[PDB]
């Protein structure tokens, strides 16, 4: 990249685009009378800062 | 409240007495400035980043 103004990570036009959507995730349809998963209070991604 | 529809004749009739307009010593220069104006910084930085993105895009798209 001959331009420092460009972000260090960016989808270059030279890189060919990726195709459309597909998602086979057939989880059990939950009968929803429940409280689901929750992370602890002080949990965050590793390098949020 | 001037826009592309506004004319320099009304600017001359309503902004002539202002001392700021008196600083421009040329009437043609004042008219050119009015035409340019008729046609806060970090977002400007993102605008330059976008400018770099679009120039790279046009170059790579032509190639």
Curated annotation (Swiss-Prot), chain A:
<protein>
    <recommendedName>
        <fullName>Pre-mRNA-processing-splicing factor 8</fullName>
    </recommendedName>
</protein>
<comment type="function">
    <text>Plays a role in pre-mRNA splicing as core component of precatalytic, catalytic and postcatalytic spliceosomal complexes, both of the predominant U2-type spliceosome and the minor U12-type spliceosome. Functions as a scaffold that mediates the ordered assembly of spliceosomal proteins and snRNAs. Required for the assembly of the U4/U6-U5 tri-snRNP complex, a building block of the spliceosome. Functions as a scaffold that positions spliceosomal U2, U5 and U6 snRNAs at splice sites on pre-mRNA substrates, so that splicing can occur. Interacts with both the 5' and the 3' splice site.</text>
</comment>
<comment type="subunit">
    <text>Part of the U5 snRNP complex. Component of the U4/U6-U5 tri-snRNP complex composed of the U4, U6 and U5 snRNAs and at least PRPF3, PRPF4, PRPF6, PRPF8, PRPF31, SNRNP200, TXNL4A, SNRNP40, DDX23, CD2BP2, PPIH, SNU13, EFTUD2, SART1 and USP39. Component of the U5.U4atac/U6atac snRNP complexes in U12-dependent spliceosomes. Within the minor spliceosome, which acts on U12-type introns, interacts with PPIL2 and RBM48. Core component of U2-type precatalytic, catalytic and postcatalytic spliceosomal complexes. Found in a mRNA splicing-dependent exon junction complex (EJC) with SRRM1.</text>
</comment>
UniProtKB/Swiss-Prot annotation, chain B:
<feature type="modified residue" description="Phosphoserine">
    <location>
        <position position="28"/>
    </location>
</feature>
<feature type="domain" description="FF 3">
    <location>
        <begin position="1"/>
        <end position="39"/>
    </location>
</feature>
<comment type="subunit">
    <text>Binds formin. Interacts (via the second WW domain) with TREX1 (via proline-rich region). Binds RNA polymerase II, HD and SF1.</text>
</comment>
<protein>
    <recommendedName>
        <fullName>Transcription elongation regulator 1</fullName>
    </recommendedName>
</protein>
<comment type="function">
    <text>Transcription factor that binds RNA polymerase II and inhibits the elongation of transcripts from target promoters. Regulates transcription elongation in a TATA box-dependent manner. Necessary for TAT-dependent activation of the human immunodeficiency virus type 1 (HIV-1) promoter.</text>
</comment>
């Amino acid at each position: 990249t001959e331009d420092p103004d460009l972000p260090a990570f960016y989808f270059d036009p030279l890189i060919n685009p990726i195709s459309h959507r597909h998602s086979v995730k057939s989880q059990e349809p939950l009968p929803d009378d429940d409280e689901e998963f929750e992370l602890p209070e002080f949990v965050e991604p590793f390098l949020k800062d | 409240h001037l826009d592309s529809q506004s004319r320099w004749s009304k600017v001359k009739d309503k902004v002539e007495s202002d001392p700021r307009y008196k600083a421009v010593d040329s009437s043609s220069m004042r008219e050119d400035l009015f035409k340019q104006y008729i046609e806060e910084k970090e977002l400007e930085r993102q605008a330059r980043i976008e400018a770099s993105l679009r120039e790279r895009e046009r170059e790579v798209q032509k190639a």
